[PDB]
């Protein structure tokens, strides 16, 4: 973990990437607020299972106690789903690729009360990534940083986070960025994580309101994840 080189760090993270899943989108019927939220909560639920497998393959994560592993995932899961969504929407300006069969524009997000506000932030993050030309190697480092950092303040984790910082710098130097450009781009990337936190908190409040108005039934897992917030 702390003995991995940067290249080994990147290879392990790339090989751990979860698959892209399909939604239960039924094209025979129009969208309603309930059926659209139903699709997103069903997808998130199936993605969480693959998330767990992925987190076990993030170096340093298996070293933690089960309780600490639970806490980190409880804190970060929606940030992780969202940075994944933004990443795979990068090559679809103006749209969010929730799934290959669920590629939506903001007009479709207006179907769910309170959704377009979060939709617009995700679109803006995707545009930010596109203009910075975020690389897949950088993306997987950022996603692992979220897993380890978001719940951390609530030494080993910090040593692993430092290794990931080293790996980001190594990637940037390998790509030919000057020394000044390296620390500038590191800062620009890490500052986007503050916005991803923000969007996660809005989506968690949105999911809570969907539950509390009986718009869609949440799985037992989703209910416990919500409940930890």
């Amino acid at each position: 973990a702390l003995s991995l080189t940067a290249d080994q760090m990147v290879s392990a993270l790339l090989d751990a990437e979860p698959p892209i899943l399909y939604s239960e989108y039924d094209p025979t019927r129009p969208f309603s607020e309930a059926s659209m939220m139903g699709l997103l909560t069903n997808l998130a639920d199936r993605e969480l299972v693959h998330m767990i497998n992925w987190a076990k393959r993030v170096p340093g994560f298996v070293d933690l106690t089960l309780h600490d592993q639970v806490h980190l995932l409880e804190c970060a899961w929606l940030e992780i789903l969202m940075i994944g969504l933004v990443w795979r929407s990068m090559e679809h300006p103006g749209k969010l690729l929730f799934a290959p069969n669920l590629l939506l524009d903001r007009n479709q997000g207006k179907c769910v009360e309170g959704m377009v506000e979060i939709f617009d932030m995700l679109l803006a993050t995707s545009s930010r990534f596109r203009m910075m030309n975020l690389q897949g190697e950088e993306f997987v480092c950022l996603k692992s940083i979220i897993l380890l950092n978001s719940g951390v303040y609530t030494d080993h984790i910090h040593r692993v986070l430092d290794k990931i910082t080293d790996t980001l710098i190594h990637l940037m130097a390998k790509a030919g960025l000057t020394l000044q450009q390296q620390h500038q781009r590191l800062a620009q990337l890490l500052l986007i994580l503050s916005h991803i936190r923000h969007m996660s908190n809005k989506g968690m409040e949105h999911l809570y309101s969907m539950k509390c108005k009986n718009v869609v039934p949440l799985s037992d897992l989703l209910l416990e994840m919500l409940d930890a917030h």
Binding site: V49, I52, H67, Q69, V70, L73, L221
Partner: peptide, 10 residues
Amino acid sequence: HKILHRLLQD
């Protein structure tokens, strides 16, 4: 235990 606790083991 939490669903998540069990899933982390399987």
